[PDB]
Amino acid sequence: GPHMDRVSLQNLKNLGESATLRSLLLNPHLRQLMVNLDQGEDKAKLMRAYMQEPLFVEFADCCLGIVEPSQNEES
Amino acid sequence: DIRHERNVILQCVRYIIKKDFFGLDTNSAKSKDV
């Protein structure tokens, strides 16, 4: 199951340290996406509707590189 | 993998909101029915 799908706080705390990622939080829309998704009014459709907005896509793609210990196979 | 990635975003978002914005703890099993 989604056991190691959960990220360790170290990796998450590194997000705020990332000059690139923190700069994304400067977007009033992006931060609204974040808080909306967390409240979970309907995370089901939000997870879809958020991946279409380039702002949240940037945020997502940025946090992945910071929290993913997963190497790029054989790159 | 998007199945993994999207859930990973949930960890990212919730961490930030936790020390940046509100820091609230609404997502808890405060139900005393159990």
Answer whether A13 sits within 8 Å of B16, measured CB to CB.
Answer: no
**Gap between the Cα atoms of B34 and B32, Å rounded:** 5
Interchain contact A28–B (C-beta under 8 A): no
* Six-digit token string for A30: 């992006």
Answer whether A67 sits within 8 Å of B8, measured CB to CB.
Answer: yes
Q: How many domains are there within chain A?
A: 1
Residues of B in contact with A63 (CB under 8 A): 8-9, 12
Report CA torsion sign: A50, A51, A55, A57.
positive
Structural domain harbouring A52: 1-75
**Gap between the Cα atoms of A19 and B24, Å rounded:** 25
* Six-digit token string for B19: 């020390």
Distance of CA B16 to the CA centre of its chain: 10
Q: Nearest by CB to A63, from B9, B17, B26: name it.
A: B9
**Gap between the Cα atoms of A32 and A29, Å rounded:** 5
Q: What is the largest CA-CA distance in chain B?
A: 38
Answer whether A7 sits within 8 Å of B12, measured CB to CB.
Answer: yes
